[PDB]
Design a binder for this molecule. Sequence first.
Ligand SMILES: Cc1cc2c3c(c1C)C(C)(C)CC=[N+]3c1c([nH]c(=O)[nH]c1=O)N2C[C@H](O)[C@H](O)[C@H](O)COP(=O)(O)O
Ligand SMILES: Cc1cc2c3c(c1C)C(C)(C)CC=[N+]3c1c([nH]c(=O)[nH]c1=O)N2C[C@H](O)[C@H](O)[C@H](O)COP(=O)(O)O
Ligand SMILES: O=C(O)/C=C/c1c(F)c(F)c(F)c(F)c1F
Ligand SMILES: O=C(O)/C=C/c1c(F)c(F)c(F)c(F)c1F
Ligand SMILES: [K+]
Ligand SMILES: [K+]
Ligand SMILES: [K+]
Ligand SMILES: [K+]
Ligand SMILES: [Mn+2]
Ligand SMILES: [Mn+2]
Lengths: 500, 500
Amino acid sequence: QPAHLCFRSFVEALKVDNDLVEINTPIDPNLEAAAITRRVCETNDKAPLFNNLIGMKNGLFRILGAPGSLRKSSADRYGRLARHLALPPTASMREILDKMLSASDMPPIPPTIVPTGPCKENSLDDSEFDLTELPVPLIHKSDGGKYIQTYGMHIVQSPDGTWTNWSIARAMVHDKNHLTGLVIPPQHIWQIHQMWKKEGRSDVPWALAFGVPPAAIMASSMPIPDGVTEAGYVGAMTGSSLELVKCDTNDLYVPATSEIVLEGTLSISETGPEGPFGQMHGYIFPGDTHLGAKYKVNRITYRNNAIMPMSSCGRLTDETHTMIGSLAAAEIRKLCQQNDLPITDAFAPFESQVTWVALRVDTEKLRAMKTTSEGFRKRVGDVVFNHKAGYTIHRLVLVGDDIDVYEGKDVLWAFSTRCRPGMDETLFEDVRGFPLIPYMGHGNGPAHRGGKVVSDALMPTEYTTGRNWEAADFNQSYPEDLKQKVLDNWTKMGFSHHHH
Amino acid sequence: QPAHLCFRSFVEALKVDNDLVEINTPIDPNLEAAAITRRVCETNDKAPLFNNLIGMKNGLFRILGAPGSLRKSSADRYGRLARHLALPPTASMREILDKMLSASDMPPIPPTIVPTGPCKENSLDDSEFDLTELPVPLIHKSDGGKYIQTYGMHIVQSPDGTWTNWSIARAMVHDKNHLTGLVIPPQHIWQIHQMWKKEGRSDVPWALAFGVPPAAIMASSMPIPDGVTEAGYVGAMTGSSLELVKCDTNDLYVPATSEIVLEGTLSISETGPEGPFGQMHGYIFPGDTHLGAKYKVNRITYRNNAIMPMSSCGRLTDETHTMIGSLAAAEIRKLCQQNDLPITDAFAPFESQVTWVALRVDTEKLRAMKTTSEGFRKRVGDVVFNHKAGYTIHRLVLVGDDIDVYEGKDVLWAFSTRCRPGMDETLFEDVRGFPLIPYMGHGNGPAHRGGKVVSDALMPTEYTTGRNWEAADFNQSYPEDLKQKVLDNWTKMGFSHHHH
Ligand SMILES: Cc1cc2c3c(c1C)C(C)(C)CC=[N+]3c1c([nH]c(=O)[nH]c1=O)N2C[C@H](O)[C@H](O)[C@H](O)COP(=O)(O)O
Ligand SMILES: Cc1cc2c3c(c1C)C(C)(C)CC=[N+]3c1c([nH]c(=O)[nH]c1=O)N2C[C@H](O)[C@H](O)[C@H](O)COP(=O)(O)O
Ligand SMILES: O=C(O)/C=C/c1c(F)c(F)c(F)c(F)c1F
Ligand SMILES: O=C(O)/C=C/c1c(F)c(F)c(F)c(F)c1F
Ligand SMILES: [K+]
Ligand SMILES: [K+]
Ligand SMILES: [K+]
Ligand SMILES: [K+]
Ligand SMILES: [Mn+2]
Ligand SMILES: [Mn+2]
């Protein structure tokens, strides 16, 4: 099966790419596998595959760390991501994000039901597993539990059957047959949970699938619209209907080639201790346990020699930056265009710990609007900060056409030199805030409200007559024939490769 | 003579360091020398020495570009700066800035007058030079003149004789015997000019010395206090009295080993067109000419085979970032400590285009103050933004003891994750602003007032009981013995030098 449609094939692809290190000697799931993965993420090294995990029994389980993290070379920096999507490994971020948005104006391709698949090779009933006996990792030394769920997909369906959501939300082991996890507004797993709680009759039928088709895990990390079934979006994006098998103990459907599947229920009444967890902004607050949602596990099914993917998340750079930030930015680009705002590109700079999004403006279009900074900032912030796609983002930076928003140095240059603090900004206190940013949930104000800003790094003439400067740089401050002469004589004169 | 006391010896030191490229074939001062230097600055390459400059006659002049710019390796990144100060080439920024501050609590060592020096080897009177016939560079394609003065020292004295100031301010050729340049408040050349204009009797006696002792050009770029003679500060810093010779046509004194000296007057009545100039924030606004101060040149003296240093300034990284930003930050550190604020370190991040300064706080001391963010931000911003040392800086970022302010990635991480926009900030509109930042002089508000902010990236418990988090990073989220095991087995397992 192709790499973007089968996790097992994705792991092969990483090997073939010389982007995997297979570790066949014993590695401890208590901190060691995650420490190695953390180091990989902080250094952009090859992804680790732990084939000999202390505590693995009867096939459960090997671990792949850093599945969506960065490569060291600039030429294939985003290659792991490209390998989730059948794109060449040299694909740009623009190309990855356009691929993720492409299904937004396509008919869905609904999934195909098949009678069996690899995820049925092995099964354990409710008398035969114990989640405390599996090699679940402790990912950070102060975590409040062993976080089994950092790169699987939760599957829940609306009571009426009309919407099946796929999403990533963290969860940890509570006891032999339960997990606890984050289920918070405005996320779709929370929106669906609320529909079942209002009906009041039963717990939510649930599955959690690990090692799913890579194209599916990418859509699971993206804020596609309310009511849109991720499976049909992924089918349109890839051009193929995804093959799904029914769960054994409920009527949900999971990818046929899933590595590991948990089946059970998400309670509409019970909670249990959850967290703390080392998280995407780079922090853990030891001891900050709170009550989370509670999942009951009734059945495990799994592939022979099953592989569990894991995100060792925290400081730069991991899946919580490359996927959460970039895919939110993609959705925000589209949302702005659909609201008739002249936005061409959007990206969440890594330097901002993916808390900012830079919005590149088509300034010819802006000029024809005959507007001002105060008016335009308000319009952009009202659109984005009132929408779910803006949930995680606390600062929007508006920049003109000379800025490449995919280059954090250029975004920081424009922000620092073109946006006057205070006067060129609009603060938004009556919007939903993201409580997991430290300055929100552990800060001086309301954890769930406000703390957002639009910072206008457009210069005044960009609204009127056009850019009135040139950069004081090699590219813009010297004519073409001189530049070329310099470059052609560079190594001649004594001064100092793209792939590497 | 030692490198820090003689520019000619400094050039040798760069050679010996394998940090110079000598270019002995003809190079055009019209853009080509500056384009090569720009490229060097954007790539951290070796400094260029142009020995065959088109238009050089009778010894005037060779050019050294990038005298204070960065080296490519991390281990000697600041080595050019270290070579201005007799420090080892591996000196840290902390060590460089401490050396620059060391004379602040020392008695001055006043200069020594000697009867002659190398700067007297050649002379041209007022019938024998023409500034339009020298190989003065055009540094950026849109500049409003040929900027002779980008790395010399202006010398002016108070009318009462009690203060002799040395400083860098830009100047360009106006005609055969005049320059125009920037002379703006609150700079010491402007403060002295105003004392002569209030007296009303004559133009200001002036000299401009190029290729001065490197330790002297560093103090020329630093905002040491009002009324302090830079020569005696440099003498205390170096432990030696600087040797000076009298000008021929006035009673000012110039370094004996200066490469080139202009003698004349700075008018108290005349102005002439000045600018535009590609400047330290990375911009030029073509056509933005304004009236500047006007200098008359009566005499040129110079060394045999004289060398003119040049800064090809603009986008990162050059002397306007490494010297202006860092030396302002040093002075701000000291100013905060003298006002009893618990600041340990200060640096202007390059990523901010040296418009921010990050202030590291001794949080044990802060806790004993028993204060709040609102109160402490106001106190820090009142001290810094009301003082000349804060002139160029528009955002202060307060950070706790875990942050290395000399590392821009860590400053950006703390700012983005610990400072809630709006609530955790105090805006300052009734302070002097720096008009050369684009969002000031070319922006939406008053060019000369406001636009400043203190952003508090201290977390709430840093004011009360102490840091309550651990980083989600390799260093802090794993025990020491595990970390060491990982590192010792790194290359064994399959994964990937300090000097490089
Ligand atoms: C890539 C990724 C996405 C995580 C994520 C992680 C990763 C690796 C973890 C597991 C390592 C850390 C926690 N995560 C959570 C999370 N969203 C949230 O609600 N709870 C989370 O606990 N997300 C973000 C979430 O997947 C996106 O917001 C989706 O848009 C949610 O899908 P939905 O739009 O269908 O609700
Ligand atoms: C290193 C450096 C410093 C420049 C500088 C440049 C460089 C290379 C240039 C020449 C390339 C671009 C312009 N510069 C000017 C400047 N200060 C200012 O008043 N006018 C300027 O035109 N400065 C900053 C100035 O030297 C510092 O603010 C000093 O503190 C001034 O000394 P003072 O405290 O004695 O007034
Ligand atoms: O990093 C974490 O533990 C939890 C992340 C989280 C979340 F709770 C959300 F609601 C999000 F929308 C999101 F993008 C997240 F990443
Ligand atoms: O970059 C330029 O042309 C002029 C810089 C300049 C200045 F005018 C000042 F007043 C300063 F204080 C300063 F630090 C500067 F760099
Ligand atoms: K999703
Ligand atoms: K602006
Ligand atoms: K000075
Ligand atoms: K704060
Ligand atoms: Mn969804
Ligand atoms: Mn001074």
